[PDB]
Amino acid sequence: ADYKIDKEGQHAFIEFRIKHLGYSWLYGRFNDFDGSFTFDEKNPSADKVKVTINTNSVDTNHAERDKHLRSGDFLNVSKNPTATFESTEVKANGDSADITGNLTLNGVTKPVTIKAKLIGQGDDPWGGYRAGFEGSATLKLKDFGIKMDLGPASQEVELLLSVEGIRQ
Ligand SMILES: COC1=C(OC)C(=O)C(C/C=C(\C)CC/C=C(\C)CC/C=C(\C)CC/C=C(\C)CC/C=C(\C)CC/C=C(\C)CC/C=C(\C)CCC=C(C)C)=C(C)C1=O
């Protein structure tokens, strides 16, 4: 069974944090992404996911910071308007799954493993069928060519992902 991520209902989130000066966590998100996934409980090998993210939609609730994040110093939105994650392997791992795939971010393509778990599923109030998932992953800024050094404690960004899918 194939699912479309609920973008219209905005039951889908890409949330991140990174330390500011190693003093506190700075929280942000991307407001504009789309994708789909195959969730097959009978044949879990068939499982796949693809997400496309418009990186100009970066949002840390600070206009000037977000403008700086859009620039060539950071996400370089003008050169690369989109980020893509497309799974290459979904492996069962205890009471969750490991979703390995290619992340292309800032023109660079490198593998990322998302630790993923089913949150809930079932028929919705409006007739449809839904399945929702949580994911976690981290990345090093330098691995995707993000030039500017933010200090020694700010090399990694932590990702918390939520997707609610509507079965097609
Ligand atoms: C004056 O203004 C300024 C400030 O304010 C005062 C500052 O603080 C600062 C300092 C700023 C900082 C310390 C913070 C800077 C923050 C930075 C650099 C972080 C920016 C964020 C990133 C690089 C993250 C990029 C991440 C992405 C695009 C997301 C990637 C997505 C990935 C890997 C996966 C996506 C996949 C999904 C959503 C699908 C998940 C699916 C499932 C779990 C299940 C699927 C189901 C089945 C069944 C398979 C500056 C420079 C400034 O100019």
PDB file of C-alpha atoms and ligand atoms in Angstrom:
ATOM      1  CA  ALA A   1       0.000   0.000   0.000  1.00  0.00           C
ATOM      2  CA  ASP A   2       1.207   3.464  -1.067  1.00  0.00           C
ATOM      3  CA  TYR A   3       0.758   6.625   1.003  1.00  0.00           C
ATOM      4  CA  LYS A   4       0.868  10.343   0.199  1.00  0.00           C
ATOM      5  CA  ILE A   5       2.254  12.552   2.982  1.00  0.00           C
ATOM      6  CA  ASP A   6      -0.484  14.834   4.312  1.00  0.00           C
ATOM      7  CA  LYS A   7       0.903  18.159   3.091  1.00  0.00           C
ATOM      8  CA  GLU A   8      -2.494  19.855   2.699  1.00  0.00           C
ATOM      9  CA  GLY A   9      -3.475  18.996   6.303  1.00  0.00           C
ATOM     10  CA  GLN A  10       0.117  19.736   7.327  1.00  0.00           C
ATOM     11  CA  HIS A  11       0.385  16.531   9.345  1.00  0.00           C
ATOM     12  CA  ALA A  12       4.055  16.317   8.417  1.00  0.00           C
ATOM     13  CA  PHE A  13       7.035  17.964  10.057  1.00  0.00           C
ATOM     14  CA  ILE A  14      10.797  18.291   9.614  1.00  0.00           C
ATOM     15  CA  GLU A  15      12.197  19.649  12.881  1.00  0.00           C
ATOM     16  CA  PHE A  16      15.840  20.257  13.719  1.00  0.00           C
ATOM     17  CA  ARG A  17      18.053  21.463  16.583  1.00  0.00           C
ATOM     18  CA  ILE A  18      21.716  22.531  16.787  1.00  0.00           C
ATOM     19  CA  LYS A  19      23.689  24.083  19.658  1.00  0.00           C
ATOM     20  CA  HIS A  20      24.195  27.845  19.692  1.00  0.00           C
ATOM     21  CA  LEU A  21      27.756  28.389  20.975  1.00  0.00           C
ATOM     22  CA  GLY A  22      27.340  25.074  22.821  1.00  0.00           C
ATOM     23  CA  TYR A  23      25.287  27.117  25.319  1.00  0.00           C
ATOM     24  CA  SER A  24      21.718  26.224  24.302  1.00  0.00           C
ATOM     25  CA  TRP A  25      19.756  24.392  21.611  1.00  0.00           C
ATOM     26  CA  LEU A  26      18.498  26.440  18.657  1.00  0.00           C
ATOM     27  CA  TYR A  27      15.284  24.957  17.155  1.00  0.00           C
ATOM     28  CA  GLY A  28      14.036  25.220  13.605  1.00  0.00           C
ATOM     29  CA  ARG A  29      12.038  23.432  10.914  1.00  0.00           C
ATOM     30  CA  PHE A  30      11.337  23.360   7.169  1.00  0.00           C
ATOM     31  CA  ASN A  31       7.832  24.589   6.364  1.00  0.00           C
ATOM     32  CA  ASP A  32       7.624  23.321   2.760  1.00  0.00           C
ATOM     33  CA  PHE A  33       8.184  19.686   1.824  1.00  0.00           C
ATOM     34  CA  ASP A  34       6.374  16.884   0.068  1.00  0.00           C
ATOM     35  CA  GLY A  35       6.754  13.156  -0.422  1.00  0.00           C
ATOM     36  CA  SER A  36       5.376   9.655  -0.321  1.00  0.00           C
ATOM     37  CA  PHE A  37       6.070   6.201   1.115  1.00  0.00           C
ATOM     38  CA  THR A  38       5.224   2.549   0.663  1.00  0.00           C
ATOM     39  CA  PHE A  39       4.138   0.859   3.896  1.00  0.00           C
ATOM     40  CA  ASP A  40       3.541  -2.829   3.422  1.00  0.00           C
ATOM     41  CA  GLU A  41       3.043  -4.923   6.538  1.00  0.00           C
ATOM     42  CA  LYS A  42       2.674  -8.143   4.460  1.00  0.00           C
ATOM     43  CA  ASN A  43       5.876  -7.510   2.452  1.00  0.00           C
ATOM     44  CA  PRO A  44       8.114  -5.033   4.435  1.00  0.00           C
ATOM     45  CA  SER A  45      10.974  -5.417   1.916  1.00  0.00           C
ATOM     46  CA  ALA A  46       8.861  -3.328  -0.516  1.00  0.00           C
ATOM     47  CA  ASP A  47       9.009  -0.398   1.975  1.00  0.00           C
ATOM     48  CA  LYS A  48      10.311   2.889   0.538  1.00  0.00           C
ATOM     49  CA  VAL A  49      10.164   6.632   1.104  1.00  0.00           C
ATOM     50  CA  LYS A  50      10.975   9.747  -0.940  1.00  0.00           C
ATOM     51  CA  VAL A  51      10.819  13.330   0.327  1.00  0.00           C
ATOM     52  CA  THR A  52      11.614  16.590  -1.470  1.00  0.00           C
ATOM     53  CA  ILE A  53      12.269  19.730   0.630  1.00  0.00           C
ATOM     54  CA  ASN A  54      12.349  23.366  -0.513  1.00  0.00           C
ATOM     55  CA  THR A  55      15.217  24.646   1.619  1.00  0.00           C
ATOM     56  CA  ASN A  56      14.135  28.341   1.441  1.00  0.00           C
ATOM     57  CA  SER A  57      11.322  27.275   3.798  1.00  0.00           C
ATOM     58  CA  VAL A  58      13.877  27.052   6.688  1.00  0.00           C
ATOM     59  CA  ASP A  59      12.296  28.588   9.784  1.00  0.00           C
ATOM     60  CA  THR A  60      14.020  29.293  13.144  1.00  0.00           C
ATOM     61  CA  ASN A  61      11.666  32.152  14.106  1.00  0.00           C
ATOM     62  CA  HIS A  62      14.266  34.873  13.434  1.00  0.00           C
ATOM     63  CA  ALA A  63      14.067  36.684  10.082  1.00  0.00           C
ATOM     64  CA  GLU A  64      17.726  37.767   9.790  1.00  0.00           C
ATOM     65  CA  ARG A  65      19.031  34.370  10.988  1.00  0.00           C
ATOM     66  CA  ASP A  66      16.813  32.627   8.414  1.00  0.00           C
ATOM     67  CA  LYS A  67      18.011  34.969   5.640  1.00  0.00           C
ATOM     68  CA  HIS A  68      21.604  34.108   6.628  1.00  0.00           C
ATOM     69  CA  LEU A  69      20.670  30.388   6.602  1.00  0.00           C
ATOM     70  CA  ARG A  70      19.346  30.774   3.009  1.00  0.00           C
ATOM     71  CA  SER A  71      22.610  32.322   1.790  1.00  0.00           C
ATOM     72  CA  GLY A  72      25.732  30.836   0.163  1.00  0.00           C
ATOM     73  CA  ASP A  73      27.296  30.666   3.646  1.00  0.00           C
ATOM     74  CA  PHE A  74      24.837  27.971   4.674  1.00  0.00           C
ATOM     75  CA  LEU A  75      21.997  26.234   2.783  1.00  0.00           C
ATOM     76  CA  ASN A  76      22.750  28.189  -0.408  1.00  0.00           C
ATOM     77  CA  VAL A  77      19.125  28.145  -1.533  1.00  0.00           C
ATOM     78  CA  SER A  78      19.880  30.100  -4.760  1.00  0.00           C
ATOM     79  CA  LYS A  79      22.256  27.352  -6.059  1.00  0.00           C
ATOM     80  CA  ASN A  80      20.318  24.411  -4.570  1.00  0.00           C
ATOM     81  CA  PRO A  81      16.607  25.172  -3.983  1.00  0.00           C
ATOM     82  CA  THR A  82      15.755  21.593  -2.923  1.00  0.00           C
ATOM     83  CA  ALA A  83      16.938  18.803  -0.652  1.00  0.00           C
ATOM     84  CA  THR A  84      16.043  15.176  -1.427  1.00  0.00           C
ATOM     85  CA  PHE A  85      15.943  12.082   0.696  1.00  0.00           C
ATOM     86  CA  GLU A  86      15.210   8.852  -1.093  1.00  0.00           C
ATOM     87  CA  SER A  87      15.493   5.527   0.743  1.00  0.00           C
ATOM     88  CA  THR A  88      17.692   2.715  -0.559  1.00  0.00           C
ATOM     89  CA  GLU A  89      17.134   0.223   2.299  1.00  0.00           C
ATOM     90  CA  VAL A  90      14.533  -0.313   5.016  1.00  0.00           C
ATOM     91  CA  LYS A  91      15.778  -2.848   7.597  1.00  0.00           C
ATOM     92  CA  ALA A  92      13.932  -4.112  10.688  1.00  0.00           C
ATOM     93  CA  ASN A  93      15.761  -3.135  13.926  1.00  0.00           C
ATOM     94  CA  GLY A  94      14.210  -4.255  17.252  1.00  0.00           C
ATOM     95  CA  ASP A  95      10.866  -2.490  17.737  1.00  0.00           C
ATOM     96  CA  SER A  96      11.568   0.013  14.920  1.00  0.00           C
ATOM     97  CA  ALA A  97      13.136   0.219  11.423  1.00  0.00           C
ATOM     98  CA  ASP A  98      16.352   1.664   9.981  1.00  0.00           C
ATOM     99  CA  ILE A  99      15.701   3.623   6.799  1.00  0.00           C
ATOM    100  CA  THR A 100      18.963   4.154   4.941  1.00  0.00           C
ATOM    101  CA  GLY A 101      18.869   6.443   1.936  1.00  0.00           C
ATOM    102  CA  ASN A 102      20.584   9.123  -0.082  1.00  0.00           C
ATOM    103  CA  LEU A 103      20.310  12.639   1.215  1.00  0.00           C
ATOM    104  CA  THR A 104      21.120  15.310  -1.292  1.00  0.00           C
ATOM    105  CA  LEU A 105      21.544  18.574   0.515  1.00  0.00           C
ATOM    106  CA  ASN A 106      23.402  21.663  -0.758  1.00  0.00           C
ATOM    107  CA  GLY A 107      24.432  19.807  -3.953  1.00  0.00           C
ATOM    108  CA  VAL A 108      26.077  16.953  -1.930  1.00  0.00           C
ATOM    109  CA  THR A 109      24.682  13.356  -1.863  1.00  0.00           C
ATOM    110  CA  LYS A 110      25.576  11.127   1.093  1.00  0.00           C
ATOM    111  CA  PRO A 111      23.758   8.294   2.958  1.00  0.00           C
ATOM    112  CA  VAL A 112      21.634   9.004   6.059  1.00  0.00           C
ATOM    113  CA  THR A 113      19.960   6.414   8.287  1.00  0.00           C
ATOM    114  CA  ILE A 114      16.641   7.362   9.849  1.00  0.00           C
ATOM    115  CA  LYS A 115      15.581   5.435  12.942  1.00  0.00           C
ATOM    116  CA  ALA A 116      11.844   5.092  12.287  1.00  0.00           C
ATOM    117  CA  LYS A 117       8.802   3.833  14.160  1.00  0.00           C
ATOM    118  CA  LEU A 118       5.090   3.507  13.481  1.00  0.00           C
ATOM    119  CA  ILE A 119       3.157   5.924  15.673  1.00  0.00           C
ATOM    120  CA  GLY A 120      -0.398   4.905  14.831  1.00  0.00           C
ATOM    121  CA  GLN A 121      -2.653   3.774  11.993  1.00  0.00           C
ATOM    122  CA  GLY A 122      -6.298   3.094  11.085  1.00  0.00           C
ATOM    123  CA  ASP A 123      -9.350   4.476   9.296  1.00  0.00           C
ATOM    124  CA  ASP A 124      -9.787   8.253   9.609  1.00  0.00           C
ATOM    125  CA  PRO A 125     -13.037  10.152  10.428  1.00  0.00           C
ATOM    126  CA  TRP A 126     -13.578  11.078   6.747  1.00  0.00           C
ATOM    127  CA  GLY A 127     -13.404   7.622   5.144  1.00  0.00           C
ATOM    128  CA  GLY A 128      -9.675   7.386   4.333  1.00  0.00           C
ATOM    129  CA  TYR A 129      -6.911   5.242   5.845  1.00  0.00           C
ATOM    130  CA  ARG A 130      -3.880   6.710   7.609  1.00  0.00           C
ATOM    131  CA  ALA A 131      -0.460   5.600   8.843  1.00  0.00           C
ATOM    132  CA  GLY A 132       1.859   7.924  10.790  1.00  0.00           C
ATOM    133  CA  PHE A 133       5.576   7.656  11.598  1.00  0.00           C
ATOM    134  CA  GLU A 134       8.375   9.228  13.628  1.00  0.00           C
ATOM    135  CA  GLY A 135      11.974   9.389  12.451  1.00  0.00           C
ATOM    136  CA  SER A 136      15.264  10.524  13.930  1.00  0.00           C
ATOM    137  CA  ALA A 137      18.609  11.162  12.258  1.00  0.00           C
ATOM    138  CA  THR A 138      21.596  13.452  12.692  1.00  0.00           C
ATOM    139  CA  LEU A 139      23.988  14.987  10.183  1.00  0.00           C
ATOM    140  CA  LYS A 140      27.361  16.755  10.171  1.00  0.00           C
ATOM    141  CA  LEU A 141      27.203  20.154   8.448  1.00  0.00           C
ATOM    142  CA  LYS A 142      30.675  19.722   6.910  1.00  0.00           C
ATOM    143  CA  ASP A 143      29.619  16.448   5.204  1.00  0.00           C
ATOM    144  CA  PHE A 144      27.197  18.374   2.999  1.00  0.00           C
ATOM    145  CA  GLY A 145      29.609  21.204   2.228  1.00  0.00           C
ATOM    146  CA  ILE A 146      28.067  23.705   4.659  1.00  0.00           C
ATOM    147  CA  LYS A 147      31.073  26.037   4.740  1.00  0.00           C
ATOM    148  CA  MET A 148      30.682  28.325   7.760  1.00  0.00           C
ATOM    149  CA  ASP A 149      32.032  27.093  11.057  1.00  0.00           C
ATOM    150  CA  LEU A 150      29.641  27.720  13.928  1.00  0.00           C
ATOM    151  CA  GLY A 151      32.044  26.697  16.720  1.00  0.00           C
ATOM    152  CA  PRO A 152      33.242  23.327  18.059  1.00  0.00           C
ATOM    153  CA  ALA A 153      29.907  22.167  19.602  1.00  0.00           C
ATOM    154  CA  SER A 154      27.812  23.070  16.540  1.00  0.00           C
ATOM    155  CA  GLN A 155      29.002  20.517  13.927  1.00  0.00           C
ATOM    156  CA  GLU A 156      25.868  18.405  14.077  1.00  0.00           C
ATOM    157  CA  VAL A 157      22.201  19.027  13.637  1.00  0.00           C
ATOM    158  CA  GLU A 158      19.610  16.648  15.076  1.00  0.00           C
ATOM    159  CA  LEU A 159      16.498  15.795  13.028  1.00  0.00           C
ATOM    160  CA  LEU A 160      13.052  14.804  14.323  1.00  0.00           C
ATOM    161  CA  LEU A 161      10.679  13.804  11.570  1.00  0.00           C
ATOM    162  CA  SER A 162       6.936  13.246  11.608  1.00  0.00           C
ATOM    163  CA  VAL A 163       4.896  12.049   8.621  1.00  0.00           C
ATOM    164  CA  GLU A 164       1.228  11.185   8.425  1.00  0.00           C
ATOM    165  CA  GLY A 165       0.332   9.377   5.200  1.00  0.00           C
ATOM    166  CA  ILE A 166      -3.038   8.995   3.482  1.00  0.00           C
ATOM    167  CA  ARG A 167      -3.388   5.618   1.696  1.00  0.00           C
ATOM    168  CA  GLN A 168      -3.968   5.929  -2.074  1.00  0.00           C
TER     169      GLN A 168
HETATM  170  C1  LIG B   1      22.180  37.603  13.140  1.00  0.00           C
HETATM  171  O1  LIG B   1      21.565  36.333  12.912  1.00  0.00           O
HETATM  172  C2  LIG B   1      22.191  35.159  13.260  1.00  0.00           C
HETATM  173  C3  LIG B   1      21.834  34.490  14.544  1.00  0.00           C
HETATM  174  O2  LIG B   1      20.881  35.047  15.368  1.00  0.00           O
HETATM  175  C4  LIG B   1      21.224  35.959  16.409  1.00  0.00           C
HETATM  176  C5  LIG B   1      22.503  33.210  14.921  1.00  0.00           C
HETATM  177  O3  LIG B   1      22.194  32.653  15.994  1.00  0.00           O
HETATM  178  C6  LIG B   1      23.537  32.593  14.030  1.00  0.00           C
HETATM  179  C7  LIG B   1      24.184  31.282  14.457  1.00  0.00           C
HETATM  180  C8  LIG B   1      23.242  30.168  14.029  1.00  0.00           C
HETATM  181  C9  LIG B   1      23.232  28.883  14.460  1.00  0.00           C
HETATM  182  C10 LIG B   1      24.202  28.361  15.489  1.00  0.00           C
HETATM  183  C11 LIG B   1      22.195  27.919  13.906  1.00  0.00           C
HETATM  184  C12 LIG B   1      22.365  27.627  12.415  1.00  0.00           C
HETATM  185  C13 LIG B   1      21.574  26.395  12.012  1.00  0.00           C
HETATM  186  C14 LIG B   1      21.977  25.516  11.065  1.00  0.00           C
HETATM  187  C15 LIG B   1      23.280  25.686  10.330  1.00  0.00           C
HETATM  188  C16 LIG B   1      21.107  24.306  10.761  1.00  0.00           C
HETATM  189  C17 LIG B   1      20.399  24.337   9.405  1.00  0.00           C
HETATM  190  C18 LIG B   1      19.689  23.010   9.178  1.00  0.00           C
HETATM  191  C19 LIG B   1      20.164  21.993   8.426  1.00  0.00           C
HETATM  192  C20 LIG B   1      21.493  22.067   7.714  1.00  0.00           C
HETATM  193  C21 LIG B   1      19.327  20.738   8.315  1.00  0.00           C
HETATM  194  C22 LIG B   1      19.037  20.338   6.863  1.00  0.00           C
HETATM  195  C23 LIG B   1      18.038  19.207   6.895  1.00  0.00           C
HETATM  196  C24 LIG B   1      17.124  18.898   5.950  1.00  0.00           C
HETATM  197  C25 LIG B   1      16.954  19.676   4.665  1.00  0.00           C
HETATM  198  C26 LIG B   1      16.216  17.712   6.212  1.00  0.00           C
HETATM  199  C27 LIG B   1      16.821  16.445   5.614  1.00  0.00           C
HETATM  200  C28 LIG B   1      15.787  15.342   5.647  1.00  0.00           C
HETATM  201  C29 LIG B   1      16.058  14.038   5.886  1.00  0.00           C
HETATM  202  C30 LIG B   1      17.456  13.560   6.162  1.00  0.00           C
HETATM  203  C31 LIG B   1      14.966  12.991   5.901  1.00  0.00           C
HETATM  204  C32 LIG B   1      13.623  13.450   5.350  1.00  0.00           C
HETATM  205  C33 LIG B   1      12.682  12.267   5.394  1.00  0.00           C
HETATM  206  C34 LIG B   1      11.393  12.287   5.794  1.00  0.00           C
HETATM  207  C35 LIG B   1      10.683  13.539   6.241  1.00  0.00           C
HETATM  208  C36 LIG B   1      10.614  10.989   5.753  1.00  0.00           C
HETATM  209  C37 LIG B   1      10.586  10.249   7.090  1.00  0.00           C
HETATM  210  C38 LIG B   1       9.765   8.987   6.904  1.00  0.00           C
HETATM  211  C39 LIG B   1       9.551   8.054   7.858  1.00  0.00           C
HETATM  212  C40 LIG B   1      10.107   8.194   9.255  1.00  0.00           C
HETATM  213  C41 LIG B   1       8.707   6.821   7.596  1.00  0.00           C
HETATM  214  C42 LIG B   1       8.497   6.382   6.146  1.00  0.00           C
HETATM  215  C43 LIG B   1       7.696   5.094   6.221  1.00  0.00           C
HETATM  216  C44 LIG B   1       8.034   3.900   5.680  1.00  0.00           C
HETATM  217  C45 LIG B   1       7.103   2.747   5.885  1.00  0.00           C
HETATM  218  C46 LIG B   1       9.283   3.665   4.876  1.00  0.00           C
HETATM  219  C47 LIG B   1      23.895  33.265  12.735  1.00  0.00           C
HETATM  220  C48 LIG B   1      24.934  32.670  11.805  1.00  0.00           C
HETATM  221  C49 LIG B   1      23.216  34.548  12.360  1.00  0.00           C
HETATM  222  O4  LIG B   1      23.502  35.128  11.287  1.00  0.00           O
END
